[PDB]
């Protein structure tokens, strides 16, 4: 469909593995908010949107409808499971690299299905957790997902990084390297 | 390899020319197969695959549900659009424009801008360069900013002045960055 703008009010996800769910709204491909289903609270992704209120119970009730519908379709499909796809991983920086100026590494994990993935960061072969964050699963029109992880850093001549991606569509974890040059 | 059964529900709105043309499409998806749909251009639930037939028939038989669905293009899509008009559609992040050699190849990095609409052109003296220019796709950072990198292959002669011209809705006047050897 062709449109000046496209929104999802919202993207609802529920899956048997876990199990787990996700509730978000999207506008022109970006995440407006998610509902933390465990804490039952709306978490706005854009500071200008904090002026609004969204009842988290709407999300919890909707996910329960998805959970019920899924159980029905598992039976009717004769337990037709999801097919694992091969995700595509790319690492790049938010801004041009200048040594000694703060930056952010971005790891895009695209063509994700099913939406179950572990994205971590490595430096000199050891895991890095400080300064790491990630988006929710963001929707795609072919009904796969993408997800983006971030690592804040101070670029330095001696220090390189890997984005590490575990997904059932991969024989072994995928490492995408980034060098400051 | 764990098995997974996945269900998605997407309540989508498509906008063209403000709210003059608005189309609502809600999609129920089993794994990656959309099985049943409500398209406001159609006005009733329609099965997309055989697995969605029982839901479509049950949902179409409920006259109150159909009435609410047929009004949702206004109660949801056009309603939420008024909120986008004073939040997301007013978001302006001015691009940062940098030129760095990579040196017969110049990289014009245009980073951290919102919204997506942008135009980047390379000039040699006062002549626009089209051959020898190659650009990345528009890159979505996931944090409500974009970037794009526009490269120019050159054979630079003495006195030549190369400029990267960037126009964007956030800019009162276009940004021009010069590079000289």
């Amino acid at each position: 469909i062709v449109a000046d703008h496209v929104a999802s009010y919202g993207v609802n996800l529920y899956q048997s593995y876990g199990p787990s769910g996700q509730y978000t709204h999207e506008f022109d491909g970006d995440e407006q908010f998610y509902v933390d289903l465990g804490r039952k609270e709306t978490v706005w992704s854009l500071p200008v949107l904090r002026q609004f209120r969204f009842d988290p119970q709407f999300a919890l009730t909707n996910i329960a409808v998805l959970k019920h519908n899924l159980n029905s379709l598992i039976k009717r499909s004769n337990s037709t499971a999801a097919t694992n796809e091969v995700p595509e991983v790319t690492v790049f920086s938010k801004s041009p690299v200048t040594l000694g100026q703060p930056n952010i590494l971005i790891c895009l994990v695209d063509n994700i299905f099913p939406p179950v993935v572990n994205i971590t960061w490595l430096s000199n072969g050891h895991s890095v957790t400080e300064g790491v964050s990630e988006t929710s699963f963001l929707s795609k029109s072919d009904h796969s997902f993408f997800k983006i992880s971030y690592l804040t850093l101070l670029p330095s001549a001696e220090e390189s990084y890997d984005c590490k991606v575990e997904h059932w569509g991969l024989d072994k974890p995928l490492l995408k390297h980034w060098e400051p040059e | 390899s764990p098995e997974d059964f996945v269900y998605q529900f997407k309540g989508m709105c498509y906008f063209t020319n403000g709210t003059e043309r608005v189309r609502l499409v809600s999609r129920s998806i089993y794994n990656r197969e959309e099985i049943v749909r409500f398209d406001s251009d159609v006005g009733e639930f329609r099965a997309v695959t055989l697995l969605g037939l029982p839901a479509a028939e049950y949902w179409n038989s409920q006259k109150d549900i159909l009435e609410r669905k047929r009004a949702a293009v206004d109660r949801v899509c056009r309603h939420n659009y008024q909120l986008e008009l004073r939040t997301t559609l007013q978001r302006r992040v001015e691009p940062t424009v940098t030129i760095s050699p990579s040196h017969n190849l110049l990289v014009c990095s245009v980073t951290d801008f919102y919204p997506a609409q942008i135009k980047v052109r390379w000039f040699r003296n006062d002549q626009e360069e089209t051959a020898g220019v190659v650009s990345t796709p528009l890159i979505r950072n996931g944090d409500w900013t974009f970037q794009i990198l526009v490269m120019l292959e050159m054979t630079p002669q003495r006195g030549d002045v190369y400029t990267c011209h960037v126009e964007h809705p956030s800019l009162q006047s276009p940004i021009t960055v010069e590079w000289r050897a």
């Binding site: 009010y9 407006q32 909707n62 | 029982p54």
Partner: peptide
């Protein structure tokens, strides 16, 4: 307030 769309229960 921002309006969401409900999913409906399968028969």
């Amino acid at each position: 307030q921002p309006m969401p769309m409900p999913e409906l229960p399968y028969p």
